[PDB]
Write an enzyme that holds these catalytic residues in place. Structure first.
Site, PDB file in Angstrom:
ATOM      1  N   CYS A 106      50.093  75.841  62.981  1.00  0.00           N
ATOM      2  CA  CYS A 106      50.155  75.693  61.527  1.00  0.00           C
ATOM      3  C   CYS A 106      48.854  75.143  60.989  1.00  0.00           C
ATOM      4  O   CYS A 106      48.487  73.969  61.250  1.00  0.00           O
ATOM      5  CB  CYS A 106      51.334  74.777  61.106  1.00  0.00           C
ATOM      6  N   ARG A 109      49.052  71.653  58.074  1.00  0.00           N
ATOM      7  CA  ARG A 109      49.587  70.364  58.448  1.00  0.00           C
ATOM      8  C   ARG A 109      48.946  69.157  57.774  1.00  0.00           C
ATOM      9  O   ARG A 109      49.432  68.044  57.876  1.00  0.00           O
ATOM     10  CB  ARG A 109      49.475  70.200  59.958  1.00  0.00           C
ATOM     11  N   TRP A 278      54.430  76.991  51.276  1.00  0.00           N
ATOM     12  CA  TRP A 278      53.807  78.001  50.416  1.00  0.00           C
ATOM     13  C   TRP A 278      52.772  78.826  51.135  1.00  0.00           C
ATOM     14  O   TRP A 278      52.270  78.457  52.205  1.00  0.00           O
ATOM     15  CB  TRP A 278      53.128  77.348  49.240  1.00  0.00           C
ATOM     16  N   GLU A 283      48.263  85.863  54.375  1.00  0.00           N
ATOM     17  CA  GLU A 283      49.545  86.199  54.995  1.00  0.00           C
ATOM     18  C   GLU A 283      50.163  87.399  54.303  1.00  0.00           C
ATOM     19  O   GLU A 283      50.749  88.244  54.967  1.00  0.00           O
ATOM     20  CB  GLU A 283      50.531  85.035  54.927  1.00  0.00           C
TER      21      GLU A 283
HETATM   22  C1  HEM Z   1      52.800  73.592  52.909  1.00  0.00           C
HETATM   23  C2  HEM Z   1      52.190  74.750  53.076  1.00  0.00           C
HETATM   24  C3  HEM Z   1      52.049  75.429  54.370  1.00  0.00           C
HETATM   25  C4  HEM Z   1      50.976  76.367  54.591  1.00  0.00           C
HETATM   26  C5  HEM Z   1      49.972  76.865  53.583  1.00  0.00           C
HETATM   27  C6  HEM Z   1      51.268  76.711  56.002  1.00  0.00           C
HETATM   28  C7  HEM Z   1      50.481  77.671  56.618  1.00  0.00           C
HETATM   29  C8  HEM Z   1      50.846  78.283  57.895  1.00  0.00           C
HETATM   30  C9  HEM Z   1      50.235  79.542  58.372  1.00  0.00           C
HETATM   31  C10 HEM Z   1      49.209  80.411  57.723  1.00  0.00           C
HETATM   32  C11 HEM Z   1      50.866  79.826  59.637  1.00  0.00           C
HETATM   33  C12 HEM Z   1      50.625  81.021  60.488  1.00  0.00           C
HETATM   34  C13 HEM Z   1      51.801  81.919  60.010  1.00  0.00           C
HETATM   35  C14 HEM Z   1      51.800  83.393  60.417  1.00  0.00           C
HETATM   36  O1  HEM Z   1      50.714  84.015  60.648  1.00  0.00           O
HETATM   37  O2  HEM Z   1      52.947  83.912  60.513  1.00  0.00           O
HETATM   38  C15 HEM Z   1      51.807  78.765  59.866  1.00  0.00           C
HETATM   39  C16 HEM Z   1      52.569  78.705  61.079  1.00  0.00           C
HETATM   40  C17 HEM Z   1      53.568  77.701  61.292  1.00  0.00           C
HETATM   41  N1  HEM Z   1      53.877  76.749  60.404  1.00  0.00           N
HETATM   42 FE1  HEM Z   1      52.916  76.145  58.653  1.00  0.00          FE
HETATM   43  N2  HEM Z   1      52.307  76.118  56.637  1.00  0.00           N
HETATM   44  C18 HEM Z   1      52.766  75.329  55.650  1.00  0.00           C
HETATM   45  C19 HEM Z   1      53.945  74.507  55.771  1.00  0.00           C
HETATM   46  C20 HEM Z   1      54.759  74.374  56.947  1.00  0.00           C
HETATM   47  C21 HEM Z   1      55.970  73.545  56.923  1.00  0.00           C
HETATM   48  C22 HEM Z   1      56.513  72.764  55.722  1.00  0.00           C
HETATM   49  C23 HEM Z   1      56.426  73.706  58.308  1.00  0.00           C
HETATM   50  C24 HEM Z   1      57.557  73.089  58.951  1.00  0.00           C
HETATM   51  C25 HEM Z   1      58.255  72.210  58.319  1.00  0.00           C
HETATM   52  C26 HEM Z   1      55.500  74.570  59.046  1.00  0.00           C
HETATM   53  C27 HEM Z   1      55.609  74.988  60.450  1.00  0.00           C
HETATM   54  C28 HEM Z   1      54.859  76.093  61.027  1.00  0.00           C
HETATM   55  C29 HEM Z   1      55.282  76.624  62.324  1.00  0.00           C
HETATM   56  C30 HEM Z   1      56.364  76.133  63.227  1.00  0.00           C
HETATM   57  C31 HEM Z   1      54.371  77.764  62.514  1.00  0.00           C
HETATM   58  C32 HEM Z   1      54.237  78.724  63.652  1.00  0.00           C
HETATM   59  C33 HEM Z   1      55.514  79.501  63.856  1.00  0.00           C
HETATM   60  C34 HEM Z   1      55.230  80.516  64.940  1.00  0.00           C
HETATM   61  O3  HEM Z   1      54.798  80.113  66.035  1.00  0.00           O
HETATM   62  O4  HEM Z   1      55.377  81.706  64.629  1.00  0.00           O
HETATM   63  N3  HEM Z   1      54.511  75.058  58.156  1.00  0.00           N
HETATM   64  N4  HEM Z   1      51.903  77.840  58.775  1.00  0.00           N
HETATM   65  N1  LIG Z   2      53.110  80.071  54.958  1.00  0.00           N
HETATM   66  C1  LIG Z   2      54.078  80.283  55.871  1.00  0.00           C
HETATM   67  N2  LIG Z   2      54.002  81.245  56.837  1.00  0.00           N
HETATM   68  C2  LIG Z   2      54.648  81.195  58.057  1.00  0.00           C
HETATM   69  C3  LIG Z   2      54.963  79.971  58.649  1.00  0.00           C
HETATM   70  C4  LIG Z   2      55.747  79.947  59.793  1.00  0.00           C
HETATM   71  C5  LIG Z   2      56.205  81.116  60.378  1.00  0.00           C
HETATM   72  C6  LIG Z   2      55.896  82.352  59.838  1.00  0.00           C
HETATM   73  C7  LIG Z   2      56.442  83.612  60.483  1.00  0.00           C
HETATM   74  C8  LIG Z   2      56.208  83.684  61.998  1.00  0.00           C
HETATM   75  C9  LIG Z   2      56.597  85.020  62.644  1.00  0.00           C
HETATM   76  C10 LIG Z   2      56.757  86.206  61.909  1.00  0.00           C
HETATM   77  C11 LIG Z   2      57.123  87.385  62.557  1.00  0.00           C
HETATM   78  C12 LIG Z   2      57.332  87.389  63.937  1.00  0.00           C
HETATM   79  C13 LIG Z   2      57.183  86.223  64.715  1.00  0.00           C
HETATM   80  N3  LIG Z   2      57.320  86.132  66.086  1.00  0.00           N
HETATM   81  C14 LIG Z   2      57.473  87.120  66.999  1.00  0.00           C
HETATM   82  N4  LIG Z   2      57.517  86.759  68.288  1.00  0.00           N
HETATM   83  C15 LIG Z   2      57.573  88.590  66.651  1.00  0.00           C
HETATM   84  C16 LIG Z   2      56.612  89.572  66.329  1.00  0.00           C
HETATM   85  C17 LIG Z   2      57.157  90.851  66.050  1.00  0.00           C
HETATM   86  C18 LIG Z   2      58.543  90.893  66.154  1.00  0.00           C
HETATM   87  S1  LIG Z   2      59.146  89.331  66.595  1.00  0.00           S
HETATM   88  C19 LIG Z   2      56.807  85.048  64.035  1.00  0.00           C
HETATM   89  C20 LIG Z   2      55.142  82.382  58.661  1.00  0.00           C
HETATM   90  C21 LIG Z   2      55.262  79.404  55.862  1.00  0.00           C
HETATM   91  C22 LIG Z   2      56.603  79.615  56.081  1.00  0.00           C
HETATM   92  C23 LIG Z   2      57.345  78.439  55.920  1.00  0.00           C
HETATM   93  C24 LIG Z   2      56.600  77.313  55.577  1.00  0.00           C
HETATM   94  S2  LIG Z   2      54.955  77.814  55.444  1.00  0.00           S
END
Ligand code: HEM
Ligand SMILES: N=C(Nc1cccc(CCc2cccc(NC(=N)c3cccs3)c2)c1)c1cccs1
Ligand code: HEM
Ligand SMILES: N=C(Nc1cccc(CCc2cccc(NC(=N)c3cccs3)c2)c1)c1cccs1
Ligand SMILES: C[C@H](O)[C@H](O)[C@H]1CNc2nc(N)[nH]c(=O)c2N1
Ligand SMILES: C[C@H](O)[C@H](O)[C@H]1CNc2nc(N)[nH]c(=O)c2N1
Ligand SMILES: [Zn+2]
Lengths: 407, 411
Positions: A106, A109, A278, A283
């Site tokens: 993330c 953070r 947000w 994204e």
């Molecule tokens: C407040 C604004 C926030 C921004 C701008 C932000 C931004 C991001 C971005 C750009 C990613 C990569 C996402 C992707 O390519 O799918 C990400 C991943 C992640 N974020 Fe944040 N985030 C925010 C808030 C949070 C919050 C509030 C949480 C949890 C409470 C969080 C937990 C995570 C987790 C767990 C991942 C990785 C999930 C995975 O491995 O697919 N984020 N976030």
């Molecule tokens: N800005 C955001 N983006 C964000 C943050 C956390 C997670 C994600 C989505 C992560 C994602 C999306 C699609 C697939 C997977 N993981 C997979 N292993 C897969 C890929 C293709 C099929 S399943 C993970 C997006 C936020 C969401 C909530 C708070 S911030």
């Protein structure tokens, strides 16, 4: 043992000690690095519980106080008896914020400590989960001025009684393949979009149809619910200079809200724990629109721009990509919906890394995900060495529930 | 053990077995990933095993594993080691070795081309003048009037570590950098330190923005010596843009031949500390890194002003827009002068095919995602969605400390 990380643009060198508290495993070994792979009893529970409680009480400067030792015993008692335990509210709040603080993927953070936590641990039915989700959505949206939040449903007990939100995000666009053979709306969701129909949804067959929520309480079959349109903020996408842009017909929702992850605090598993903050603009603009297997609109935008699409080396894809992303940022900003650009988000995250190196002795970070999918080397995270390790409390992936649920 | 990698754009899955032939350390462990960290004299003792592994590989590649020729070569190398504490590679062994170091370079997007490498054996060279001659012939052959061809020149191996051959230059062709008194920098900031050493050793700097640095060459553990590359050998390209006529007035140019001269080539336990190699540029290496890194020429601001972009807010994406234009210019300029260059879309596409080919015929391809994914437009190139396995095979190219840090001056 004491590892160093260098920033090659600034020569700044930070020293990491926090990794020695690393507990879980990375998939990597002495022989093989797997940095780019997407996903590589009463006994188990007390160590886990003690570990977490130790950092809680240390965080409030009461490590080795009476209350600390009393708590360790109370939980020790509760475990030896019930085979689980319950967290106090204060512990829940600390756990959730810390699972965000430890998400190495993330970039967002810097905001970790401003997280609103809704305790839904008293919930018992899908209708109830639906009420809690609506209030989460509405609170978080805040008429465009978005606020981070998480809602925590009851912890898994024996794996038969799981609460799950089947949606991967709360708010996503429908996808349907046609006899024609190509795709309408968002191909990411084609499968889910059909499950919903396969359980009852009457799809308004369209491009940007917000999907119904599909909720499972206490291991039971799940139920369809439409989130009230009034609660789903959307932004029509237009360009600050290209008037034809609007006529592409593009919109996107303002609230990203991840709903398929598992939250681990002191050995307890929370399988339905949707959270939201947000967007960073790329994204939507880079991944949702331009991925080959998503809306894939590059060709179309390139043409309207009258670019030389004949040879890759005109860089027409890259030109189109930048204008699309300018468009998304412009729209959100125009409509007063919170959004962050990648230059600003990465600058923030460098600041936060620095804060975490001195206040805490490190910051686990996964470069493969923190570097944005466009303009990588002109953002500062590109030049920052990072160390990736798994600390707890954490968010984890978990299998898609349709592969696991028995009906 | 088998390991799988998936592509997420195409659902193509591949199986790695080659990683089993790996031995060297990554930097990573079960508890930590160092995947984004830039950099995480031998005895008879360790030399025998390393020479045997290398020779076993060599003779399997030529389908002569376990032949009398194999066994005699082993016996010959073993005697030579316990006799002299080192050994000499045959020509054919050197060729194979250099090519495989390239093939094993997990950070190299250009590896589709690995088998077409011209190897120059400079193992009879004894002086810096002789090194200069070899480098000049390498530069002219590689350049080939714009139609670039890959090559490497291999000087004598390390012996006691007191008689090393080194090219003090990081690349054979690079522009000077000069730290001005007012704090700014003239020419390339990456080369300031090397520029100072050169000046100190007696180079008269023209002190302009694109002065080709002299070669600084150490033979046999001697103090190194200055040589100017003949300018008719240094192919350069003025940078213009196909639509913006003011672009040329920015005064930019770049050289055509990228030739890395500071790595260490390891083959069968032997160490070649001077082994300059050259190929051709991917456009982004000039256009993104060389011009638009903040610690390099950093022309982004100037290009943005001339495009009259809105520079008041980063969310205008004015940096991103100027960057695409500068890279369009670079590719246009090279193509127009018929100097080989590859764009990042084309290079990355080719690499995915190389990689699938290498899985099929070899059982793997070690790959470092952090370095393979281009520094702009990452996710619209196919490598972004490619899962990759990183591990170290030998023969290989390794980093080595800068020689000014280690050298014992004689005077
Ligand atoms: C407040 C604004 C926030 C921004 C701008 C932000 C931004 C991001 C971005 C750009 C990613 C990569 C996402 C992707 O390519 O799918 C990400 C991943 C992640 N974020 Fe944040 N985030 C925010 C808030 C949070 C919050 C509030 C949480 C949890 C409470 C969080 C937990 C995570 C987790 C767990 C991942 C990785 C999930 C995975 O491995 O697919 N984020 N976030
Ligand atoms: N800005 C955001 N983006 C964000 C943050 C956390 C997670 C994600 C989505 C992560 C994602 C999306 C699609 C697939 C997977 N993981 C997979 N292993 C897969 C890929 C293709 C099929 S399943 C993970 C997006 C936020 C969401 C909530 C708070 S911030
Ligand atoms: C033929 C055309 C070639 C192209 C287009 C090509 C492309 C690339 C690019 C774009 C990089 C990353 C460089 C950077 O980020 O600064 C790279 C790295 C590398 N390449 Fe290739 N390359 C080619 C030929 C070769 C040859 C002929 C060799 C050796 C014989 C080679 C060995 C490597 C090594 C060792 C690295 C990594 C350097 C490091 O770790 O610092 N390349 N190549
Ligand atoms: N650790 C570093 N090493 C370093 C510094 C600058 C450049 C490089 C890599 C140079 C390189 C290596 C291999 C290939 C390429 N590009 C090419 N197209 C080729 C060059 C020779 C044959 S192909 C460039 C490595 C640093 C990074 C930033 C400051 S120092
Ligand atoms: C295979 C590869 O790891 C995969 O494409 C990753 C790369 N980096 C990423 N980075 C982010 N932020 N989100 C992603 O989905 C991905 N995908
Ligand atoms: C910290 C990080 O490893 C470093 O900035 C790397 C990232 N990826 C790179 N990729 C390439 N191709 N060249 C580089 O110099 C770098 N720098
Ligand atoms: Zn690793």
């Amino acid at each position: 043992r004491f590892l160093k990380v260098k920033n090659w643009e600034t020569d700044v060198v930070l020293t990491d000690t926090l990794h020695l508290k690393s507990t879980l495993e990375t998939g990597c070994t002495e022989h093989i690095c797997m940095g780019s792979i997407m996903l590589p009893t009463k006994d188990q529970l007390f160590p886990l519980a003690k570990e977490f409680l130790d950092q809680y009480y240390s965080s409030i400067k009461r490590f080795g106080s009476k209350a600390h030792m009393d708590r360790l015993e109370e939980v020790n008692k509760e475990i030896e008896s019930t085979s689980t335990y319950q967290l106090k509210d204060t512990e829940l709040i600390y756990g959730a914020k810390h699972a965000w603080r430890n998400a190495s993927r993330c970039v967002g953070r810097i905001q970790w400590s401003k997280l609103q936590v809704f305790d839904a641990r008293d919930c018992t039915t899908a209708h109830g989960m639906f009420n809690y989700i609506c209030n989460h959505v509405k609170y978080a949206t805040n008429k465009g001025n978005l606020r981070s939040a998480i809602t925590i449903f009851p912890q898994r007990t024996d794996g038969k009684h799981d609460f799950r939100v089947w949606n991967s995000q709360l708010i996503r666009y429908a996808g349907y393949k046609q006899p024609d053979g190509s795709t309408l709306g968002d191909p990411a969701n084609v499968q889910f979009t059909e499950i919903c129909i396969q359980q009852g949804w009457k799809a308004p067959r369209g491009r940007f149809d917000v999907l119904p929520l599909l909720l499972q309480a206490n291991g039971n079959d799940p139920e369809l619910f439409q989130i009230p349109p009034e609660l789903v903020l959307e932004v029509p996408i237009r360009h600050p200079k290209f008037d034809w842009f609007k006529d592409l017909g593009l919109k996107w929702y303002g609230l990203p809200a991840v709903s398929n992850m598992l939250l681990e605090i002191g050995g307890l598993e929370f399988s339905a724990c949707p959270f939201s903050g947000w967007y960073m603009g790329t994204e939507i603009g880079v991944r949702d629109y331009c991925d080959n297997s998503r809306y894939n609109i590059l060709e179309e935008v390139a043409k309207k721009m009258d670019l030389d699409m004949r040879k890759t080396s005109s860089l027409w894809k890259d030109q189109a990509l930048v204008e699309i992303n300018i468009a998304v940022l412009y729209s959100f900003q125009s409509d007063k919906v919170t959004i962050v650009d990648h230059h600003s988000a990465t600058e923030s995250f460098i600041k936060h890394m620095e804060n975490e190196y001195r206040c805490r002795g490190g910051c686990p970070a996964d470069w493969v995900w923190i570097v944005p999918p466009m303009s990588g080397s002109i953002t500062p995270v590109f030049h920052q060495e990072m160390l990736n390790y798994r600390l707890t409390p954490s968010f984890e992936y978990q299998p898609d529930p349709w592969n696991t649920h028995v009906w």
